[PDB]
């Protein structure tokens, strides 16, 4: 709140732009003689003698300069005198350089050579270059030069492999990137700016002078965010300013960082490669044609005074003026006696027969060219332009007439340079004006020939009267001034709406960094500030606050920024967004907002469009008015009762060039092409506006409109125009035959050619017919709640895709909209990219509806570029059943906070009174009903709100009742497990010392868990595997209380088995008659009821709260992106991130959720670079970073040890427990404020902040090549992580999301959570299960099965969801038996099942295997398809890879390219592989994991995942294997298994097991078993006495083990019957620990097969498999054969090591 003065900004500004001298005096050099021709002025100023070399100052050839530069200076034997002077600051500095020299002194290879050093960092040896390690930016401020620039560039460095492109008019993949001011301004602008400019180590500016132009303000605006972001990103970048030689250059120098004793050079005059004698005319008097006569005159007195050999370049401001100027020579050189006549000498046909030879061509130029005459111009000759060109290069054109676009464009100089008149029209100014100073430096520039000329001349026309100007200009004496007072809104809110400025301060400093600052300093009269007011403010603190403060109010006006003076701050708007995005004027902005509504006709958008500001000094003149009503009378639009006004006009050129008519007058087309340039920006704009305010019809216009300015033809015309290659009369013909482009799909080629009467192209049209982009839409619709449906809409492309004609993808909108086709309900970006192509895309989303139901929605996809090219899916709600309106939440009662001491136990008090002194209100609220009562209660409740202590409760009352009880503890996540089991190990074995156990992969050990546990804590899955058998195993019949936390989860993936086993649960408690008290626990379920009935609590049992009862009260806030691209997305969302730290948690402690593992490294460094760029370093650290070095000293990772230091921490699933239990202690501490952890952490974090950022909800999913939306389940989750009651009066949430799911976010987070269940599509592996223990014996015992499930009590509440037609009973009964029916019927086509008498059920073997090892059901259908007698190991791997537990190993963003490289280097290479599909990548992990290849940690996170279920996996293909009696096969299987587990191959060193051991061990060993191994041991090689006790430890574990075996009755054998083996098993070493296998995660068990079978015929004739402990007895029994003899062979095999096999024949 400082004291601010509103300015008057036009008087403050410079009026007449680039034509504004600060320039009081010029003072001419040397000759300054004046002639007086009486017709006009003539001032002539001579050239510059050539300068004598300075001090030591030499020439330095190409060869000296550093070798790997070399390339791109062959052509060059000599470097320029400029070049050497700058060689050892471009190349072996980093330093900002300014580079000032007079126009065409070939700066040029100055910048080379800094790109050059750039370069020449990324050599890489054997590599030539790194080329997606770097970009550098050209900007350049004409198109012309860009192009000329990308070529010249293109070849120098095409050497070095690299790629020059052009932006304005495969981004990623440019190095080099050349591009206009407005062109990269309009870049940056997009905040996702950084994807382009993350690379970017070097900017080069080149004709940095244009800063004194209306263009300058641009250049200001981008040096000054580019230089920001260098502070701010910390990155280094180097800037190369390159500049024409006027005063103020040094300001320019302190604008760009340059030090003016380091990288600051300026040349003089004297520089100038060829000295050029120049000539100033100007016209004494103002009459017409007597003027342009004089002018004539002129050029005709001054070209003769070159009569034989010299080239002149004549340069005129109009198209059409090259012919008139040419004709007005013509005119009075060859009608006074033929003045000068044969230019060329050679009219006996020197070069004249090869000028003549080239006549044939068109236009002016055939008249002209056998002469030495030429023409080079904008109104496009094409082909014809660079033969001219080539033929005034070889000096046979002798006078050319061109436009300045060839001295931009292309390089050739002439001799001499004639200027002729310097007034040009100016459409946005609207008049004739002075020609723009940049364009006078480039065309005088070209004078005078570098290696053809010792000495140049050049003649500028001009009128007398204020013109002194021009030779200020060339003579460098026109000041650089700065322009940014005109342009400072539109910069300002540019800058707001990044994120740069967020408030009146913000923006002073940002004002700092203009070129307007240093001038206002330097110069403060001439900006309008007093020597007394800048002497009492040095800085102009006040000046730049007043500025910001006028702009503020400006914006604010306009609605683009709200601003409050109070404050100073901005807030964005969208109005705003949209405005520095589409690059529009902020007075347009407020125009579009006035005059912009739904019901806009067609001509209303036409004039609204024609009231923006960019055409506001268009008028219209009466020399063009008759062509004008011409051209109304030929376009369509009537354009309303507007006269010729300006505004008519606009909009009549506009429609004009839709129409593709031609036009005569010129300034009509100078307007025209400005209007056209202009439109589809400013109509892209309003396409936006009104698409977010969801307005179906104006949406649709403006659209339509976007593609018509864009492909220029109406809606009207034929949609096949848009193909260009396509003769436009064959089109005409089709448009005169009436009807419908969609009938051409059902006609033959024939038919085609035969309707359009034109056969020829009947193919040819066929062709572009089907290449018409064309969709198919499908929509299944489940219902959610009454407010809202699901929508599944499946978008199928039908039509031959072409990269030339579709380019690498397509874009379309996918618009929901009501009944009317009023309202846009819901939209969103869809983009079909050509390499997916062909697959079906699956988009989900939710949808609003209002209970008087319409009858149907519509959903159009329309395409973003194509006119005519839409499909229409009406929604039909006709059959559509609403869920039932849920009921209300149970009132919450405040009750006096209930005192810990009503626990009665001063034991179970001392595990709280330190805590807490009494419980929250839903603590004390269900506290009598857990604690006091025994029956079955249910919590719903907010994460964060404490129901954990409930369940708490709920145990003390079991302990209470019987000391010996049993509590078994359910939670979703492993994560949430494994805290819980730390916490109550805690408060129960320690304290209250019970038994706490958690249970594991492994059955035995979990029996024995299970045995012995007081408290069991486990995840769904383990606890499903246990009790499935319950009718067999007792202890989990007999549990006092089974709680299960987090059920709303049951909603999620992974859900069913959660249903699963607490629907059995019930049907155990309701057989035993001991009922099982049931505790479940949720987050505010919008039906509790169902849950409760579910679980068999009462409704006074049952406590669901509305969220907003939360302990901690939330503050939620939600931010819309309107962006599709994701990492676009994300990368505008870092700074919001930053500003949600400082405005809503400054000092308290903040969680920031990201989508991915490097997004968290990422956002914290974002957030760090932020933070001290806010000249505010280790705000974000509470303690000095002294105390902090003894424990980051225990860290590995780099970045973690300096994020840290900062202050800030992250978390993803690549740091080690160590690591992240430091991080997680540090925040908890108060050491750091700021955490950053990754989505998938959410669930294993234990720690809680005052503010929780969610950084977008999507995640990529590989596999579909598609972005998914986070289960609202992770949200829910993260939302509570800001929860704390000790410390804070409340918890604040900011989520950050695509604007489409903003409002989604505003209802389930506030609004109570709908659940269903999934297990309708889960049930094939739970009912083989309940077939296989005969739980379901019967089709009758599988529909009295489902009636326990939550699944039946969701199905005639939402009958829709599960696709039921009706909640009659009738329905139900009929929906559930066509269940039963399809389940049971796909697990007999799969062999797991039999059915018999269309009631009855039985296990087959299939299934046993499946439900003993808990495979899926189709992972053994498919073991039992592709397994055979032949099968070996690799085709094993092959079999195994392809379970259906892998399909959800995850394909993160571009590891296909990892995979590739992966798929080359492994033993066995893989056929056809796609990259993303998961079996094809744990194929590949599975070869690395044998071949010990060490990866990336995600990738080894993934062979941890695959490697868990892998055992069970290759034991069920045993199982199979031997079912079919296969011997090879099999103990293949059994070596696999074994090869796993040890991490080695199939032919190997059995030695590699032994720890320490390397391939260079090995080598020594054998001049190779385990067996054959102090003295003589360890002296074999190199050895260390750690290594000794692990090798020890091995070998005291590592099998030792003798079989004794005997066929009972070796000789009362015979045919038929029955065949006793009988083996004994006894090893000598007393078995202490589990197997040693370093690279196998997780602790296993031995266990081994005892097989018996021919060797011979391959069979496997028996086999059993045990666990060996001390001894053991093994009975085989099998059938006899015939004949009495036969030779067998008994394995004895591993699953663990290789070598402890053991083989005896017998018979
Ligand atoms: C992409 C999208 C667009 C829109 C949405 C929601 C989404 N979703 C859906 C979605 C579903 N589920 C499953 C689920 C399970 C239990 C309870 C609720 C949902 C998630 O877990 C996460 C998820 N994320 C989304 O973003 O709402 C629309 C909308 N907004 C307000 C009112 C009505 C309405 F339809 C606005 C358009």
Do not use: S, T, V, W
């Given at each position: 709140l400082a004291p601010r003065q509103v300015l008057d900004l036009e008087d403050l500004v410079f009026t007449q732009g680039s034509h504004f001298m600060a320039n009081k005096r010029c003072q001419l050099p040397d000759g300054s003689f004046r002639r007086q021709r009486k017709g006009y002025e003539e001032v002539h100023v001579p050239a510059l003698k050539p300068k004598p070399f300075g001090s030591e100052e030499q020439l330095l050839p190409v060869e000296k300069l550093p070798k790997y530069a070399q390339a791109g200076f062959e052509g060059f034997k000599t470097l320029n005198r400029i070049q050497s002077k700058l060689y050892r600051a471009a190349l072996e500095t980093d330093e900002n350089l300014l580079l000032c020299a007079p126009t065409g002194a070939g700066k040029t290879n100055v910048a080379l050579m800094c790109m050059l050093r750039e370069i020449g960092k990324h050599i890489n040896m054997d590599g030539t270059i790194n080329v997606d390690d770097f970009k550098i930016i050209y900007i350049a401020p004409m198109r012309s030069l860009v192009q000329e620039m990308v070529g010249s560039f293109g070849k120098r460095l095409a050497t070095y492999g690299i790629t020059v492109a052009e932006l304005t008019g495969e981004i990623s993949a440019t190095q080099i990137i050349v591009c206009t001011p407005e062109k990269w301004d309009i870049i940056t602008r997009k905040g996702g700016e950084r994807t382009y400019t993350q690379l970017v180590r070097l900017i080069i500016l080149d004709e940095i002078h244009l800063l004194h132009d209306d263009r300058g303000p641009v250049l200001e605006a981008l040096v000054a965010r580019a230089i920001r972001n260098i502070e701010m990103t910390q990155e280094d970048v180097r800037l190369i300013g390159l500049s024409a030689t006027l005063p103020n250059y040094e300001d320019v120098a302190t604008f760009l960082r340059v030090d003016p004793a380091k990288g600051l050079f300026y040349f003089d005059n004297s520089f100038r490669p060829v000295p050029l004698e120049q000539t100033y005319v100007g016209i004494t008097e103002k009459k017409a044609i007597k003027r342009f006569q004089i002018m004539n005159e002129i050029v005709y007195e001054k070209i003769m005074?070159?009569?034989?050999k010299n080239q002149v370049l004549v340069f005129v401001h109009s198209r059409k003026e090259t012919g008139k100027t040419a004709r007005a020579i013509r005119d009075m050189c060859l009608e006074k006696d033929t003045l000068g006549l044969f230019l060329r000498e050679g009219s006996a046909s020197t070069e004249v027969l090869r000028t003549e030879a080239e006549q044939c061509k068109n236009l002016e130029l055939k008249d002209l060219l056998p002469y030495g005459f030429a023409i080079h111009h904008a109104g496009m000759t094409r082909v014809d332009r660079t033969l001219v060109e080539d033929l005034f290069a070889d000096k046979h054109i002798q006078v050319l007439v061109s436009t300045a676009t060839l001295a931009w464009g292309v390089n050739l100089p002439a001799h001499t340079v004639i200027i002729k008149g310097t007034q040009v029209y100016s459409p946005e100014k609207g008049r004739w004006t002075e020609l723009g100073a940049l364009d006078i430096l480039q065309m005088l520039g070209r004078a005078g020939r570098p290696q053809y000329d010792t000495k140049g001349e050049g003649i500028l026309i001009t009128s007398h009267g204020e013109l002194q100007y021009y030779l200020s200009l060339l003579n460098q004496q026109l000041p650089i001034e700065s322009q940014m007072v005109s342009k400072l809104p539109d910069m300002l809110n540019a800058e707001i709406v990044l994120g740069n400025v967020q408030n009146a301060k913000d923006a002073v400093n940002w004002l700092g960094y203009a070129y307007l600052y240093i001038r206002m300093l330097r110069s403060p009269t001439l900006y309008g500030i007093s020597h007394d007011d800048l002497k009492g403010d040095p800085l102009l603190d006040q000046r730049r606050l007043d500025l910001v403060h006028t702009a503020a109010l400006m914006l604010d006006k306009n609605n683009l920024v709200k601003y409050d003076k109070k404050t100073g701050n901005f807030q964005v708007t969208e109005l705003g967004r949209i405005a520095s995005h589409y690059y529009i004027t902020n007075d347009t902005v407020q125009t579009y907002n006035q005059l912009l509504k739904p019901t806009l006709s067609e001509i209303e958008l036409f004039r609204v469009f024609s009231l923006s500001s960019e055409f506001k000094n268009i008028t219209v003149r009466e020399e063009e008015k008759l062509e004008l009503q011409k051209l109304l009378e030929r376009v369509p639009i009537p354009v309303k009762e507007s006269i010729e006004e300006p505004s008519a006009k606009i909009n009549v050129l506009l429609q004009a060039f839709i129409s593709q008519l031609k036009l005569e007058g010129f300034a009509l087309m100078a307007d025209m092409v400005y209007v056209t340039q202009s439109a589809g920006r400013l109509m892209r704009a309003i396409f936006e506006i009104v698409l977010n305010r969801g307005w179906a019809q104006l949406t649709d216009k403006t659209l339509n409109l976007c593609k018509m300015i864009d492909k220029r033809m109406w809606q009207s015309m034929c949609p096949l125009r848009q193909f260009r290659k396509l003769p436009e009369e064959v089109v005409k013909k089709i448009e005169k035959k009436?009807?419908?482009?969609?009938?051409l799909y059902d006609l033959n080629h024939n038919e085609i050619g035969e309707l359009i009467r034109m056969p020829k192209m009947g193919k040819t049209i066929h062709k572009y017919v089907h290449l018409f982009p064309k969709l198919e839409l499908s929509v299944h619709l489940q219902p959610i709640t009454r407010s809202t449906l699901k929508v599944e809409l499946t978008i199928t492309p039908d039509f031959q895709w072409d990269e030339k004609v579709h380019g690498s993808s397509e874009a379309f909108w996918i618009l929901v909209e009501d009944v009317d086709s009023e309202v846009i309900l819901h939209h969103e970006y869809f983009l079909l990219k050509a390499k997916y192509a062909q697959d079906e895309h699956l988009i989900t989303f939710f949808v609003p509806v209002f209970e008087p139901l319409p009858p149907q929605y519509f959903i159009r996809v329309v395409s973003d570029r194509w006119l005519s090219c839409e499909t229409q899916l009406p929604v039909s709600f006709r059959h559509l059943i609403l869920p039932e309106k849920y009921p209300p939440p149970t009132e919450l009662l405040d009750l006096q906070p209930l005192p810990v001491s009503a626990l009665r136990n001063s034991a179970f008090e001392s595990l709280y009174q330190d805590k807490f002194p009494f419980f929250n209100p839903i603590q004390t609220q269900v506290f009598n009903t857990v604690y006091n009562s025994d029956d079955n209660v249910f919590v719903g409740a907010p994460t964060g709100s404490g129901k954990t202590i409930c369940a708490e409760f709920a145990i003390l009352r079991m302990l209470l009742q019987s000391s010996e009880g049993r509590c078994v503890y359910i939670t979703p996540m492993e994560a949430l497990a494994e805290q819980v089991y730390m916490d109550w190990y805690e408060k129960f074995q320690d304290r209250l010392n019970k038994k706490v156990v958690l249970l594991t992969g492994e059955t035995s050990t979990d029996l024995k868990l299970l045995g012995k546990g007081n408290i069991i804590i486990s995840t769904p899955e383990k606890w499903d595997i246990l009790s499935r058998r319950w009718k067999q195993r007792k202890n989990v019949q007999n549990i006092n209380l089974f709680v299960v936390d987090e059920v709303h989860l049951i909603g999620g993936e992974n859900g069913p088995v959660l249903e699963v086993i607490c629907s059995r649960m019930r049907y155990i408690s309701s057989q035993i008659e001991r009922p099982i008290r049931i505790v479940a626990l949720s987050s505010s379920l919008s039906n509790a009821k169902d849950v409760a009935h579910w679980l068999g609590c009462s409704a006074t049992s049952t406590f669901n709260f509305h969220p907003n009862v939360r302990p901690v009260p939330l503050e939620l806030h939600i931010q819309g992106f309107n962006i599709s691209h994701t990492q676009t997305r994300l990368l505008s969302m870092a700074k919001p991130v930053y500003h949600a730290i400082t405005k809503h948690s400054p000092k308290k402690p903040v969680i920031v959720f990201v989508p991915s593992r490097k997004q968290t490294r990422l956002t914290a460094i974002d957030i760090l670079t932020t933070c001290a760029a806010?000249?505010?370093?280790?705000?974000?650290?509470?303690?000095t970073e002294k105390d902090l070095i003894p424990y980051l000293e225990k860290l590995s990772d780099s970045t973690l040890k300096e994020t840290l230091l900062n202050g800030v921490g992250y978390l993803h699933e690549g740091l080690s427990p160590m690591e992240r239990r430091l991080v997680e202690q540090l925040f908890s501490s108060g050491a750091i404020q700021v955490v950053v952890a990754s989505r998938s952490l959410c669930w294993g974090m234990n720690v809680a902040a005052h503010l929780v950022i969610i950084m977008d909800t999507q995640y990529y999913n590989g596999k579909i090549h598609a972005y998914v939306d986070y289960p609202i389940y992770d949200v829910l989750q993260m939302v509570g992580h800001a929860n704390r009651p000790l410390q804070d009066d409340e918890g604040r949430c900011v989520i950050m999301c695509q604007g489409s799911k903003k409002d989604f976010f505003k209802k389930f987070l506030y609004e109570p959570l709908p659940v269903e269940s999934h297990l309708d599509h889960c049930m094939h592996d739970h009912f083989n299960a309940e077939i296989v223990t005969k739980t379901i014996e019967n089709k009758q015992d599988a529909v009295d099965y489902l009636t326990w499930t939550f699944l039946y009590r969701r199905m005639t509440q939402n009958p829709n969801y599960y696709?039921?037609?009706?909640?009659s009973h009738r329905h139900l009964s009929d929906h559930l038996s066509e269940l039963v029916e399809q389940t049971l019927s796909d697990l007999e086509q799969s062999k797991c099942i039999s059915i018999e008498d269309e009631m009855d059920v039985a296990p087959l073997n299939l299934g046993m295997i499946a439900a003993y090892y808990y495979i899926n059901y189709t992972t053994i259908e498919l073991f039992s398809m592709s397994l055979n007698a032949k099968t070996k190991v690799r085709g094993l791997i092959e079999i195994i890879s392809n379970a259906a537990e892998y399909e959800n190993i995850p394909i993160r963003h571009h590891e296909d390219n990892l995979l590739r490289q992966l798929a080359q280097k492994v033993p066995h290479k893989l056929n056809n592989?796609?990259?993303?599909?998961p079996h094809v990548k744990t194929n590949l992990l599975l070869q690395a994991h044998l071949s010990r290849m060490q990866l990336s940690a995600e990738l080894q996170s993934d062979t941890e995942e695959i490697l868990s279920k892998a055992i069970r996996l290759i034991q069920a293909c045993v199982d199979v294997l031997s079912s079919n009696g296969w011997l090879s096969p099999a103990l293949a299987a059994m070596e696999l298994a074994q090869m796993v587990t040890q991490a080695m191959w199939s032919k190997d060193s059995y030695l590699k097991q032994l720890p320490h051991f390397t391939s260079e061990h090995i080598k020594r060993c054998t001049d190779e078993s385990v067996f054959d191994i102090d003295e003589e041991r360890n002296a074999l090689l190199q050895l260390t006495d750690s290594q000794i006790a692990d090798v020890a430890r091995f070998c005291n574990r590592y099998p030792n083990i003798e079989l004794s075996y005997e066929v009972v009755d070796k000789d009362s054998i015979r045919s038929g019957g029955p065949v006793v083996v009988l083996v004994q098993l006894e090893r000598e070493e007393e078995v202490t620990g589990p197997v040693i296998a370093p690279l196998f995660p997780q602790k296993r068990e031995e266990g081994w097969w005892v097989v018996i079978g021919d060797a011979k015929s391959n069979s496997l004739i028996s086999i059993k498999r045990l666990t060996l402990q001390q001894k053991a007895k093994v009975k085989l029994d099998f059938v006899a054969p015939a004949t009495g003899a036969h030779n067998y062979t008994l394995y004895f095999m591993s699953d663990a090591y290789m070598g402890c096999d053991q083989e005896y024949k017998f018979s």
């Open positions: 005074e070159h009569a034989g009436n009807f419908p482009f969609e009938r806010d000249i505010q370093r280790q705000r974000f650290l509470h303690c696709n039921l037609q009706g909640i592989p796609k990259f993303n599909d």
